[PDB]
Amino acid sequence: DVLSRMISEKAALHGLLNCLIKEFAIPEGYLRYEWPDEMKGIPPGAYFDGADWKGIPMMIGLPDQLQLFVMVDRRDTFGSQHYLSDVYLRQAGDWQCPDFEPLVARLLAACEHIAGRKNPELYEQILQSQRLVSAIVSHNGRQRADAPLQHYLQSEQGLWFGHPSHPAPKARLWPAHLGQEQWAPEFQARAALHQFEVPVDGLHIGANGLTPQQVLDGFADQQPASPGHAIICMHPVQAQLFMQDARVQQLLRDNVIRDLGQSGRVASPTASIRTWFIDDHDYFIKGSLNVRITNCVRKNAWYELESTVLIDRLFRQLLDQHADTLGGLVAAAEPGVVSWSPAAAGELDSHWFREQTGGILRENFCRRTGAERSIMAGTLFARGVDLQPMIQTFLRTHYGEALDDNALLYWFDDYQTRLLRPVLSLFFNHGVVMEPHLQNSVLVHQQGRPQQVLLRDFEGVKLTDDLGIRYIDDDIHPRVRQSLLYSREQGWNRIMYCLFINHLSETILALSQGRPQLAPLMWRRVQQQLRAIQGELKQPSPELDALIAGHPVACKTNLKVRLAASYVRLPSPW
Ligand SMILES: Nc1ncnc2c1ncn2[C@@H]1O[C@H](CO)[C@@H](O)[C@H]1O
Known about the structure:
Bound molecules: adenosine
Distance between the termini: 43 Å
Number of strands: 23
Keywords: ATP-binding, Metal-binding, Nucleotide-binding
Helix content: 25-40%
GO molecular function: acid-amino acid ligase activity; ATP binding; metal ion binding
Organism: Dickeya chrysanthemi
Structural class: alpha+beta
Family: Belongs to the IucA/IucC family.
Protein name: AcsD
């Protein structure tokens, strides 16, 4: 419990170092792998461990007379390293090791001068995200370290620390008056979804291979509705919000719509917070929620609600027909979509409604892929309750004995074939831009042995203006078309940050913990894959050649955005 607090700070602190490094120090060149002149204030124990140094000295010149020292376990062009000491800072001066709060005060404080822009909210958010993490750790701190990985839902609920490179991972600014512990996957949160009785004339249903009626069936047991009516459901938090609107009030006071209880299915919220998982239900429920959670506000905007539909119909046309050109793609359907809005409301309203009431079903792929056989990547490669990459002990148990270097490179290599081949085939063959970061990705495994890397999330999916866009069957609202349209370098920036800096960087960092020498080998294995896959592509790919030949990699900046998205340029690992 004090231990708990201290684990949460080390995670939240390392998370923040990751932003600082990747988003400022490496791109703006404030980083040096060198010992300081004076060590006064840094205790031997911080950098010497009896035998040898605790790794490599890392130094940042934060351009305001402030200096930062930290022992890292490796040199890394992406910033992906393990921090093997506390953090120390200077002025004059003498090195010091301030508590977590003043340590955040101060790092942040410097980040602001480097970015010219300040965010007082972000600060209070950082401590919030950290405080939750304590509670989280504290609640789960007695479990087998790797239990998260044993089971799909549990891996959706063992992402104890959130975004590895994010200043406020667990911060969820909804009305504090609605709690926090009861809407957290990480507290094993469960809840019967909030429902509403609405008349069938306002329904907007998008289905693919599914009857309008079957979509409804998916979201809510349609029975309790009187005829001419239907049952939508929402996040219970969304439900309070959505009921705040003068508009809805009116609707309620006029019995145009009935507010049923939290009376829907009992589901568990997923790591994405507003998606819900019912075991052996054919679908997840991906509802909206007007709350900032990490970056954005998790509404399905009205146009996004149309586009899921098209993307699904797209992904099937392709999977059905263009198999070979997809490098092995496995994707979760988003086959059905529902929203409601008063029959006669005029579109500033109609829209507003459909985005409050928006719902999207995702195929519960655990049915195709087996509960105990599929693990959410972000968790696959996360640090468990002891700040130890869970992947290690998971594999050690699946492969009987401890795994030598070459086992680990093999493993890594089966993995990354199956993440790279589909993402990149999708991009260059079709202009379909995916968002394959750690959370948008689920590993399917035959007892350790990677089978598929399932991808999902059509919100994230965009289409390139020269290519991807062409699968758009043109009678599409100009606003919808606008949400899908990525410029091809806009788009390649995403694919780059996602596969490389968010996903594999981290996959690597997880496996090579304790064995940094594995890092560079792994990336070299990456680079061959890059070339072999290219050899296979059926369209040109200059940006790929660029990358293979070691040109710099795009990296989305989480912290800088919140302070002043912006992508910065990080040196290739090769
Ligand atoms: N490594 C990650 N990258 C992107 N999103 C993540 C990551 N880990 C967790 N998430 C969660 O996934 C959602 C982003 O789609 C957010 O709710 C975010 O908090």
